[PDB]
Amino acid sequence: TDRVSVGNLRIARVLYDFVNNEALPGTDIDPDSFWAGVDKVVADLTPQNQALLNARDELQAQIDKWHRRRVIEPIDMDAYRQFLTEIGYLLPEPDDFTITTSGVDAEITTTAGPQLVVPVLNARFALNAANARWGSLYDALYGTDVIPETDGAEKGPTYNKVRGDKVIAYARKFLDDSVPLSSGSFGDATGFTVQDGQLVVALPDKSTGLANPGQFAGYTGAAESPTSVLLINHGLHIEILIDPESQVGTTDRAGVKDVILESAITTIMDFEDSVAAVDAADKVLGYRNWLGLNKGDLAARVLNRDRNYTAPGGGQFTLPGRSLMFVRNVGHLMTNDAIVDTDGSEVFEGIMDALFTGLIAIHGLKASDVNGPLINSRTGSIYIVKPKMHGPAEVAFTCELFSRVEDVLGLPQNTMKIGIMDEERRTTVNLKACIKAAADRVVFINTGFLDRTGDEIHTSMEAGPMVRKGTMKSQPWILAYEDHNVDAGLAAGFSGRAQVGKGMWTMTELMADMVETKIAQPRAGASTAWVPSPTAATLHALHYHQVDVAAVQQGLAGKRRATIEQLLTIPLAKELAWAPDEIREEVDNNCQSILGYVVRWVDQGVGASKVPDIHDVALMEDRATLRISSQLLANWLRHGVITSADVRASLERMAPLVDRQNAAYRPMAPNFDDSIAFLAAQELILSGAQQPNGYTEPILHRRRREFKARAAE
Numbered sequence: 001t002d003r004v005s006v007g008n009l010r011i012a013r014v015l016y017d018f019v020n021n022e023a024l025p026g027t028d029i030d031p032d033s034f035w036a037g038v039d040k041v042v043a044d045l046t047p048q049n050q051a052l053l054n055a056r057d058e059l060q061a062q063i064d065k066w067h068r069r070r071v072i073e074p075i076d077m078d079a080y081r082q083f084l085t086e087i088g089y090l091l092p093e094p095d096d097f098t099i100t101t102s103g104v105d106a107e108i109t110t111t112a113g114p115q116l117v118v119p120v121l122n123a124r125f126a127l128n129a130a131n132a133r134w135g136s137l138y139d140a141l142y143g144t145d146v147i148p149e150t151d152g153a154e155k156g157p158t159y160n161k162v163r164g165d166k167v168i169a170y171a172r173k174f175l176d177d178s179v180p181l182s183s184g185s186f187g188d189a190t191g192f193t194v195q196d197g198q199l200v201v202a203l204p205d206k207s208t209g210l211a212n213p214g215q216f217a218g219y220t221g222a223a224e225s226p227t228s229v230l231l232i233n234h235g236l237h238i239e240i241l242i243d244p245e246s247q248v249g250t251t252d253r254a255g256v257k258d259v260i261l262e263s264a265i266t267t268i269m270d271f272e273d274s275v276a277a278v279d280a281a282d283k284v285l286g287y288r289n290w291l292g293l294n295k296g297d298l299a300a301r302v303l304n305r306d307r308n309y310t311a312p313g314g315g316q317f318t319l320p321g322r323s324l325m326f327v328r329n330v331g332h333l334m335t336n337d338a339i340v341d342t343d344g345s346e347v348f349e350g351i352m353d354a355l356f357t358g359l360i361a362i363h364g365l366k367a368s369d370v371n372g373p374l375i376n377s378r379t380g381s382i383y384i385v386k387p388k389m390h391g392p393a394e395v396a397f398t399c400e401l402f403s404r405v406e407d408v409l410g411l412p413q414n415t416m417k418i419g420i421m422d423e424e425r426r427t428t429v430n431l432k433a434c435i436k437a438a439a440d441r442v443v444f445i446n447t448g449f450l451d452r453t454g455d456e457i458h459t460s461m462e463a464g465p466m467v468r469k470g471t472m473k474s475q476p477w478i479l480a481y482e483d484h485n486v487d488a489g490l491a492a493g494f495s496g497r498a499q500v501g502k503g504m505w506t507m508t509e510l511m512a513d514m515v516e517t518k519i520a521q522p523r524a525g526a527s528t529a530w531v532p533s534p535t536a537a538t539l540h541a542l543h544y545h546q547v548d549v550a551a552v553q554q555g556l557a558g559k560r561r562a563t564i565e566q567l568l569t570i571p572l573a574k575e576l577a578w579a580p581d582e583i584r585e586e587v588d589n590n591c592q593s594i595l596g597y598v599v600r601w602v603d604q605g606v607g608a609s610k611v612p613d614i615h616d617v618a619l620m621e622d623r624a625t626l627r628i629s630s631q632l633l634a635n636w637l638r639h640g641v642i643t644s645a646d647v648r649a650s651l652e653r654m655a656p657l658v659d660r661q662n663a664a665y666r667p668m669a670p671n672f673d674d675s676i677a678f679l680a681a682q683e684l685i686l687s688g689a690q691q692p693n694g695y696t697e698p699i700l701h702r703r704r705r706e707f708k709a710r711a712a713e
């Protein structure tokens with residue numbers, strides 16, 4: 001009726017045409033054999049994929065039952081650990097080994113810096129993300145609360161000089177700290193020149209060079225009156241733009257216009273938790289954006305070209321003007337009716353994504369005929385982040401999938417590299433084996449701490465009531481999880497070979513707090529960590545200039561700072577831990593968060609957006625935070641902390657508040673049960689305990705499809 005038959009598969013026409021007319025041409029893959037391959041791969045790997053999913057359920061049932069047959073609330077760690085081993089949850093750790101992944105770009109093996117993650121369905125965000133390799137420090141400081149909006153220094157309709165001066169001073173201090181002068185301060189600079197290949201900085205009473213002249217990387221314009229000077233520190237570039245006749249330069253002692261930081265070294269184009277894609281139409285819109293990015297012709301605004309510099313000696317060179325791109329595929333769980341078989345059964349979306357995003361990525365290995373000749377991966381790798389994997393057999397399966405896809409695409413084996421999200425408990429406690437199962441493909445491990453927290457709650461759902469959502473970030477289990485991740489990577493030889501990454505900062509308006517606190521991540525040895533915007537990427541870059549990540553990692557070598565016991569420490573709430581008002585606040589906090597997110601997901605197909613919590617702090621959250629909130633209330637409901645009336649009342653109380661915050665928006669109040677979005681939120685909480693591993697996708701997908709079908713009437 002609207003589907004194309006290929007072997008046992010019935011492919012939605014919109015997807016079939018997209019692949020044939022847009023994805024395949026230029027790849028030199030015969031369409032016939034591609035589609036035959038899709039059918040073969042799906043048929044061969046579907047059974048294993050299903051067996052893996054059934055194994056999760058069998059494990060979770062056994063754990064649930066272990067908790068229900070015990071009364072002793074002080075959990076016996078010795079017996080729990082033995083139980084997990086018996087049932088195959090906790091596997092033996094393999095002998096020491098080193099990863100052998102090759103053909104990986106410098107941005108991944110060597111450079112430490114921010115990693116930006118954006119929804120691929122939003123073409124403009126995606127474009128801005130790709131262009132976010134360079135970002136204005138002045139704009140990041142002026143536009144955020146990193147420079148406090150104190151009296152006199154508030155941002156108005158026009159340039160506030162008092163504020164600008166604070167921005168300038170902040171950046172002079174950064175420069176002093178990052179690329180020190182031999183004597184004196186950048187704050188007192190009057191000019192820059194290049195003399196015999198050395199950077200010279202004029203002070204009022206003298207001239208001076210850098211304390212480390214090798215931090216001078218280049219310049220533009222005349223050496224004796226440069227338009228910019230390029231510095232490098234800890235592998236990251238810093239560009240001072242010189243323009244006395246500019247609106248800012250005119251007020252600056254050296255005529256400096258801006259300081260540009262190399263910011264988002266790598267970007268993850270997300271098909272998973274930050275997007276809403278429930279059918280072939282949604283997937284195509286995403287695939288098309290991924291295609292445009294890899295061909296370099298995406299336009300919503302266009303992709304930046306490379307940056308040209310003059311070397312200290314006077315020669316010419318270029319730096320990449322774009323972030324190196326990963327794509328995040330969906331995980332092993334969900335099916336999607338973009339393709340169905342002859343029984344009407346939907347095909348696994350993870351299998352589809354590997355095939356399609358892998359196909360499309362081939363274009364990023366060829367020179368863009370357009371805004372190029374930017375090759376995404378010069379070293380010939382395709383970078384796919386695989387989320388939500390549970391344990392080493394699931395990693396093995398992703399390997400096999402990637403291997404079979406490479407064959408269908410005619411790519412060399414191991415072309416398709418894997419960024420492993422460590423964001424499920426069964427991966428956390430078997431991490432070394434997981435890395436080993438991908439020892440030839442792995443290019444990162446990353447602590448997806450939000451999903452990890454969700455999995456923590458669901459796995460131990462039957463053990464007792466959990467601590468509040470805000471308490472979770474500082475629990476012993478999570479701190480051990482974070483340290484264990486770093487330790488496993490380093491011991492597997494990631495240093496110099498693969499990224500060790502940490503998680504997302506979600507408080508987009510609290511940039512001063514981000515600058516003060518997120519430095520903890522590179523201090524702990526992470527070579528990269530996630531940010532949600534180009535602005536946040538520029539500000540997080542500051543941290544990699546303050547912290548020598550390579551040195552931190554080498555200082556950590558051989559350390560064993562987390563035990564299996566610490567990892568298995570369930571975040572159970574203590575006896576009488578909350579007063580009535582604290583319980584109410586937490587319920588209201590979670591309900592508002594769920595409703596605010598779900599209404600845009602279900603009604604407008606938006607997978608990530610800003611939602612003010614119970615303190616008005618605007619959070620840029622995605623499905624993972626929804627997973628936490630819904631599981632936490634499900635856990636409180638399961639154990640009698642709150643009643644179903646408390647939840648209902650809270651949802652009904654927060655709903656008009658969420659309608660206010662969104663004032664093409666259809667209001668949830670007052671006809672709650674006429675709102676598909678309101679009912680979805682309720683369902684996420686009330687059925688949370690019965691969702692597989694607490695995953696929210698089954699409900700969101702069902703409800704979004706219901707909504708779309710209504711709008712079609």
Ligand SMILES: Cc1c(C(=O)/C=C(\O)C(=O)O)ccc2[nH]ccc12
Nearest residue numbers: 273448449450451532620621622624
């Ligand atoms: C991409 C993302 C995540 C995210 O997916 C993190 C992880 O996968 C995790 O912690 O599990 C969380 C919050 C966000 N806000 C804007 C983008 C965004």
Ligand SMILES: [Mg+2]
Nearest residue numbers: 423448451624
């Ligand atoms: Mg996640």
